[PDB]
Symmetry: D2
Subunit: 501 residues, 4 copies
């Protein structure tokens, strides 16, 4: 099943890309990369050092100052970003396969990511030359005032394992479109598609040092990427505790930060929702990508009048979800990403039971022989819980949902907002007026009305509260990579003569 993807690795680079060259780690260290479907070592790549990271940041600064890219016309930068987009489409099949091999998600999930990635690059390619800044009506006579937008500078970018190429395209596109130099480091356990995308960008051609790729989770590599004085912006997508640590580091040089740290996304279902649609979308929110996608709906809030019927209907569908190899077209859910992540998920099951919650279905590794070698976990539904519980307040980022009941509209909103997170959520009801009222009160970066999962390049994505700082995608996403400069010219300068002559 996976052997065609295994073939691709025969030609994939194993090294870092620093300052126009594929290089090993300064100490020759390496890391084994695994396929989560069978836990087999499938590739070995360089494990970079903090000096490698250092050298990349300084190369990115040197290229920035040269102006080769930063002072290129916006139109031409747009054409190059478009050329990356065209590469993604041209190598769509291989890229989708490489992503399924590395992360375990189904091939159709990977193809959908490859479509999004193409559109992300294409969107930024188009936006690149559309806004150079503003002319201001100066309140001072005989002055000309303008705001010019410049690339922010050297940017470090840390991407997560869920999921590599898609989140990388969110950061890379705007950075290249605006003229920044970047240093990217993907998750130590999933570097395959990122290494491939760097090979393709190298084919498109960028001046030396504009793009650099650091691999691994080496000692203090993160520190250097978040704390180096030549960095102007650190953009991190991943876990909350690392995110916080990254921000503390960025403070040492008063460096701009952008964070996206996941969330406990609510899926609110009223008793006047289209029922079968809500059940369908509750499965999709809970179990696409094994519940590991950023948009996952792990917190179901359902109105008390239909709660029992919704629970039975959901549980009945969950038992039919097909687990298996992501390359097998019959598979509906692949495995979770690592031993460590599967272990955290298991332990949250113990906490659930101990707290009084009911594991209504799932909650364990599956039996079947073809899944035994893999990092599989059964899709899980947890009932009879409430907001005071750890399993409701803490995000597990696995194929697991909790179900809480609510009596009124006001209670739904209150419960949905009762979390430290604020990334995304949905409201299901045929009463659109009501759904709009709810949407307006939810503290969430994105709200879906009668849908679940949609994100796209045209609109910004990001969190309120502990889910993040800043936005990716849209004009706002482009803005994270820009800095504003006010240039004021006194066209008729006269002596002030404040001080005695």
């Amino acid at each position: 099943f996976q052997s065609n993807a295994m073939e691709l690795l025969k030609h994939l680079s194993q090294r870092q890309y620093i300052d126009g060259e594929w290089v090993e780690s300064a100490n020759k260290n390496t890391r084994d990369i695994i396929n989560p479907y069978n836990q087999e070592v499938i590739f070995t790549v360089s494990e970079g050092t903090k000096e490698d990271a250092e050298r990349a940041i300084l190369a990115a600064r040197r290229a920035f100052e040269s102006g080769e890219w930063s002072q290129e016309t916006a139109e031409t930068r747009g054409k190059k970003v478009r050329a990356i987009a065209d590469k993604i489409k041209e190598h769509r099949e291989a890229l989708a396969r490489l992503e399924t091999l590395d992360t375990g998600k189904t091939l159709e999930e990977s193809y959908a990511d490859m479509d999004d990635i193409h559109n992300v690059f294409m969107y930024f390619a188009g936006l690149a030359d559309k806004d150079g800044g503003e002319m201001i009506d100066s309140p001072i006579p005989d002055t000309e005032s303008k705001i010019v937008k410049e690339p922010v500078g050297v940017v470090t970018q840390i991407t997560p394992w869920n999921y590599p190429l898609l989140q990388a395209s969110w950061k890379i596109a705007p950075a290249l479109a605006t003229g920044c130099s970047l240093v990217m480091k993907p998750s130590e356990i999933t570097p395959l598609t990122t290494i491939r995308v760097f090979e393709l960008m190298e084919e498109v051609g960028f001046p030396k040092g504009t793009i650099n790729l650091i691999l691994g989770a080496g000692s203090e590599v993160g520190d250097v990427m978040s704390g180096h004085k030549e960095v102007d912006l650190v953009s991190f997508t991943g876990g909350i505790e690392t995110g916080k640590h990254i921000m503390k580091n960025a403070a040492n040089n008063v460096t701009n930060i952008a964070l996206e740290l996941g969330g406990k996304n609510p899926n609110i279902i009223f008793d006047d929702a289209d029922f079968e649609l809500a059940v369908d979308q509750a499965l999709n929110g809970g179990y696409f990508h094994a519940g590991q996608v950023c948009s996952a709906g792990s917190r179901i809030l359902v109105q008390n009048s239909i709660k029992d019927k919704f629970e039975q209907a959901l549980i009945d569908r969950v038992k039919k979800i097909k687990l298996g190899n992501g390359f097998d077209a019959d598979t509906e859910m692949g495995p979770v990403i690592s031993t460590e992540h599967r272990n955290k998920i298991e332990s949250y099951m113990d906490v659930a039971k101990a707290e009084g919650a009911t594991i209504a279905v799932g909650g364990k590794r599956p039996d079947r022989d073809d899944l035994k070698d893999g990092l599989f976990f059964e899709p899980t539904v947890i009932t009879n819980c409430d907001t005071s519980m750890r399993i409701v307040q803490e995000e597990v980022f696995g194929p697991v949902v909790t179900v809480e009941g609510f009596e009124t509209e006001q209670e739904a909103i209150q419960l949905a907002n009762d979390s430290i997170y604020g990334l995304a959520g949905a409201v299901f009801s045929k009463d659109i007026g009501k759904a709009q009222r709810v949407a307006n009160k939810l503290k969430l970066g994105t709200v879906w009305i009668n849908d679940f999962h949609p994100y796209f390049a045209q609109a910004p994505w990001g969190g309120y509260k502990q889910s993040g700082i800043g936005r990716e995608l849209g004009k706002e996403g482009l803005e994270e990579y820009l800095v504003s400069k006010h240039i004021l010219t006194n066209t008729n300068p006269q002596l002030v003569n404040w001080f005695s002559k």
Copy 2:
């Protein structure tokens, strides 16, 4: 001279303003406030505790959630902000006097601040109802996509002693215009105008808890203001080390931060500049507000061909600068702000000499009997220095300039950018083309061509590098107080049927 201002204090409140009430500190502690012209204790105000700060933040959260202000129409919020602006103008004389009394700057400097403050409020009042968000052309058929702008939420705001009411208006105006609730804490040594502005805002009328005022530098008050979980944005203007500490704290709850930490602002003078203008503006950049204003030009870069002549002409003017009471119309420069700040300035003079720099004039406290009781420091020019020196790389924020020579345009730019700062700077030359080239290469939030000092509400202000994060003033400043929410409605929802039925 100062007795009319002393009269105003007879009716000024001495307390904090928390949740619609003027209150003492929870432990009844107080702090003596000084006039830097004579070091006399002129007022005693409450010294708040961390619990006071806590209570204000929670009151601000409660008011935010009630919607009284946050859900008010933008137009009406604009009218109230306009009403504050009108108060400032109506009480312009008293406010200017109170500011000269507290900070020591000349009365004309204070009147100019009062004009700026009126225009800041008036600008935000006008901008308040001009942008509600965007409609997006959704890439998904039968979806409606919109971005709605909401107030960011609870905001804490820490203002500096240089200078109180002006920097406070930069933060307050956009916060009220967008519908946020705020908690402000001015510098412990200059709370007078801030207390007055709160009395005036109370007259305009805001729902209980929308605005709160905390006084002092109490134990952990800053920590609570920067680290409390109910805060959505911390905005701090002040010293670099406190700024960094504030950001590290804000990270504990992944809270948005906005910082403005001063700079080492360059004033580049070419040999084809209008000479007398450049000398005049070099004095203004170096010595307005005793060199303590955010826009101060402490780093003069002058072309080698006119360096000796520029130095003599500058030194000759510096000896004529009139020091004195800020209420005496003859005064051209008042005192520095505190014993501590004057001490730091003295010690930088020792470091200058030890490093080999020449104190060409000034560098000490003045003799005169009418200045003896005050915190006066002579306007100072430091020659024969270079970029490698601490006195050139570190900002003193006093009435002191350094003079370095440069041979070429390329050297001017290089030297000007050779600092950890990036707030503001100027270029003087009759060759406008050249001045534009230089302006485009300087890493600075604001660049003046043939001028020095101008900031205004219509344009954003803030720093590159260690001078800050974010912007104040302009549409950008308003944006710091807003959060974006993507609402996506599927107008024709259909079952996805990904999972087996």
Copy 3:
């Protein structure tokens, strides 16, 4: 009424109150009783020519055009405060001149205050753009400048309101203007010009021409020094104005009213729909731009709806706008009332039914005024002239529809495209309908609202351009692309 003893009677040209160049005057009438209440100057085309040339001179001097946007904003705001300050008197004068109820005039005054305040705050918010030039070593900018000299012609229904929509952005942007209100309703406009002089503007920046003199209209639309002609009024006059503006390739902005549909589905809040159908049809005797004369109601509830509407129409209280009990005043003039009567003759000839009203009220206290009964025409169809043509009177037609699709097809079957409503508790549907209607403004479960924050204007024959909002400000600006080559090199295309 005492107000009139202090009000000027002259034109305002180049900083001076002046009579007509031939001393001609015109009598102004109170439609409530047809009494002459004031006499004002009736300008000549030479007066109009003189104001245009003055506006142009002031514009060129730069005193207003080169003033800082912030300061222009502060003066527009001072005008707004003067409106609020003189709110009562202004309301009374509008009611005297136009006949609408005192309450209608108060609401106008509140709107006018907000219109001026909106543009005052917008004045200094956009100077243009910096462009990222595709040519290396070039700087590219777009500067927004005031469009220049602007002529403004306002209608009689909301004289002061429509005036503020034009005056506010013109002043905010730095243009010089020449305004001419409806010849039958100049009072509040004269008064607002007094208020403006109190604020103080450079000579020629604002000018007021009065009347309907011979070729005054033509000079305002066809003079070569005009950069923009802004007209709100009748479609025939509008077309003529645009043809004239064409002689100098002059920018035009037109608002020509419309045949505005009121769509009522059977799942609408029934009582609400009846209430809003009345409001749509009869606020200001149906002479307001946002009036909903074309009612479309779903067949399932058509009979119930017609009966309820008609029963309510019979209770509408006609009377003096100054009396607290009046719910609808008289129509504006003899000619307009005659037009409304002609339109009733067309309805009859086409075979429609006058379910109620259709004539002048009989009552004694109403005898002397220009009153017309609120009227409902039933049993008509889209092919009839009374459905296709707008009368701008206290009259509504009622047609039925079977489906959503049929309601859209009928509502879009007219030459107009200004505004309309959809009433339905199914918000999903109301939105589908609103996205398909060719109207500048669509209301979902409401009727009439307009405000400074959002643009207003028509698709199709209801206009060209927009007023209010940022788009409204933009009619008064022009873009200039200044491109600077920072490293100019010889091209050497032609042999040396």
Copy 4:
């Protein structure tokens, strides 16, 4: 030239290549030698009527108008790539039809590629706005919709370039269009329509009408189903078009050329100014929209400047646009050349001096073509018809000025307002001048540049509206304010 054996000869209406309804045709000429090179259909007003009704039907079906903006963008991009792909052939065909040098045609092709690519990227970037409503419990939005059906008339100087300026935004926004190129220069337009069919659009979304048939122009400007008429060409035709559009209150966008000043101060880079004065006057034989026929030079260097310019003008190499040595081709047609000759007769009658040129070249190889010598007219003034009127030919006038102020006053003394330049090493001054010029585009130390990223169009009689940039996109959109009352309450104004 071989290219022509494969090129269509018909119109393109409602997804089909069709002849004229009366089978009439017209002969197309190569201005280099006046040979008939192709024969195409000559449409009737009925054909035009049919395309409009087809564009309207397709627009209403929603196949293109309701397609996602992102997908519309991708198809506009595929058109752009087809331009680059067929760059050589297209350049050769433009040169064949218009006579300009192969190098001029290549630059056009590069520009056209960038125009399409710009709008392709702009398509999905702005859907409208959310408004913060001043009314509580209301949601207010402004949705931007395609304007509808658009008629587009392009000129003969840059047929394909001017076509791309109109086609690109129309397609990007979702409009349906009907285009009619200049009757004497249809070749590249026909070819671009073939390219578009290869990309594939819904039937009726694009339509091509050919010729100058009787009342074809009038139907394109006056038909009631048109929402926007976009015309680039002569000022008289433009005015007539606007008067016609007025009959249905139709939006107009006009670009009518101009009398573009080239201002040369005595502190300009002298050699640069001479070089750019030549370029401004004689690129495309001075028939391009951005041509600088009116030279204003400071008196201090006027004599030196005139002599240098004239000496260079004598060396300009006229010839076949396909030969690498040619620097200027022939003028477009017999009529236009005759107009240029008439204008030389006016210069003489007014007493001006033909310093050089002013007639047809005498040489053998040029005998058969529509050649006109590059010409310089000296000793003229602003009061003369030759200074005030534009000929769009290879001719420039030279006038002197004493001061900055006098240069501004002279440059603005014309009925036009399209583009101009200022040359001076004193950038401060050049900027003062540029801010005072009433021109849509001002170049500082350059001449000619225009690009997709910035708007282009005229003040005064040079146009209404703008093309290129965001403002260009906006002519093809219309705003709709949808206001939703989320808590509707009865008003109860009328007694229950």
